[PDB]
From Swiss-Prot, chain A:
Origin organism lineage: Eukaryota, Metazoa, Chordata, Craniata, Vertebrata
Portion of the full sequence shown: 25 to 53 of 108
Protein's name in the database: Insulin B chain
Organism in which the protein naturally occurs: Sus scrofa (Pig)
Tree of life domain: Eukaryota
Gene that specifies this protein: INS
Length: 30, 21
């Protein structure tokens, strides 16, 4: 449950820095 | 997805970029 929830918070954080400009879609497991 | 490619394992800022729009 929260591990994947924990990690995800870091995840979408990195994706804000790296993607900056173009933004992104956070789609979990999918 | 993103979770198993990058949580269990480790992504660089290059690998993670795959994931931009």
């Amino acid at each position: 449950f929260v591990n994947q929830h924990l990690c995800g918070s870091h995840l979408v954080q990195a994706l804000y820095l790296v993607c900056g400009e173009r933004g992104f879609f956070y789609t979990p497991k999918t | 997805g993103i979770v198993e490619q990058c949580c269990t394992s480790i992504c660089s800022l290059y690998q993670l970029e795959n994931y931009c729009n």
